Amino acid sequence: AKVKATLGEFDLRDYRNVEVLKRFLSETGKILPRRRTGLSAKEQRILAKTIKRARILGLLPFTEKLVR
């Protein structure tokens, strides 16, 4: 179940697209590894950097408590 398939077109540089970027995050709020996102090398760097801007604007979490 890889993330990038479950989505149509999206801008890898849009730091405000919470609903899309939120999907590239572990349930604890961490950035998901490539094996879980299906992104290439070049795409994953863009995803990482725009996730980080989004967190700084308060739109994405830096970390989440792990609920069982």
Binding site: K4, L7, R13, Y15, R53, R55, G58, L59, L60, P61
Partner: protein, 100 residues
Amino acid sequence: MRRYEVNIVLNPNLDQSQLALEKEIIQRALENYGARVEKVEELGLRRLAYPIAKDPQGYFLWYQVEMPEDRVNDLARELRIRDNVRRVMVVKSQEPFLAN
């Protein structure tokens, strides 16, 4: 010049009048620094992922200005003086990068 995107987060507990004055300070500041607003998007209240200034919400603004590159840092500094401005991110505008 260059096109930038000015992101601003404000105190979510201001009345519409105080908010109007805060947008007035911002708009004149943009003007005073030679920022040419092209687009502008105002999303207002949004539940944040973490409390900013010990509050779970934030009032969001967004401007797709165009301005001379040597002044954007000073504009960022001036926009940040107001106690009611909680975040300012002046990012460079760039072409979208699309997957799928």
